Write a protein that binds this ligand. Structure first.
Ligand SMILES: CCC(=O)Nc1ccc(C)cc1O
Length: 182
């Protein structure tokens, strides 16, 4: 409907796949080459389904900060025959607050879904399902089951992936440029 939705659509149409694990279907953001991200609670194993195709996982790493605190991001390298568009230049370098974000989801349950969530706070620490988690973004939208892995964007930046909610607020794990240096 406007330039926020425009940037979000451009990311969804080229840089997402539907990932299926034993824990469900998730929006999965492709970042560069065969490297993507997914919430760590997806419990990625040695095999994953990508757009309903059986795919070997070449590597998977559940990220933690240097205090050995969960970040809820798993980086996955897929044995796929095609590379993602390189979007690392859209990733923020530092922890920040944001205005006017969009949360975008693409699954069998919620195809072509876009939500204007408004202001995003650098919330920091969250007890996420009992697990102490750092680098959490918060937005005041009543997000639901089915939105995990959703992409959080502003105009020109890809800032996080949706990892939870409390019925009134939604929570995303930050993406930082430093997670994807090669
Ligand atoms: C029910 C399985 C379980 O451990 N759930 C769970 C809760 C919180 C987080 C952060 C990850 C999770 O995997």
């Amino acid at each position: 409907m406007g330039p926020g939705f425009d940037f979000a659509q451009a990311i969804m149409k080229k840089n997402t796949v539907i990932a299926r694990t034993e824990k469900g279907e998730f929006t999965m953001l492709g970042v560069y080459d065969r490297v993507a991200v997914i919430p760590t609670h997806a419990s990625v194993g040695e095999i994953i389904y990508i757009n309903d195709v059986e795919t070997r996982v070449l590597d998977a790493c559940a990220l933690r900060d240097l205090t050995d605190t969960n970040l809820e991001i798993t980086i996955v390298k897929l044995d796929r025959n095609q590379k993602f568009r390189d979007i690392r230049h859209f990733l923020p370098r530092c922890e920040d607050d944001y205005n006017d974000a969009v949360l975008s989801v693409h699954t069998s349950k919620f195809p072509n879904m876009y939500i204007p969530v408004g202001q995003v706070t650098n919330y920091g620490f969250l007890n996420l399902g009992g697990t102490p988690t750092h680098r959490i973004l918060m937005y005041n939208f009543p997000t639901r089951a089915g939105q995990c892995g959703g992409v959080v964007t502003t105009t020109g930046k890809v800032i996080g992936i949706h990892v939870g909610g409390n019925g009134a607020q939604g929570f995303a794990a930050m993406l930082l440029h430093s997670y994807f240096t090669d």
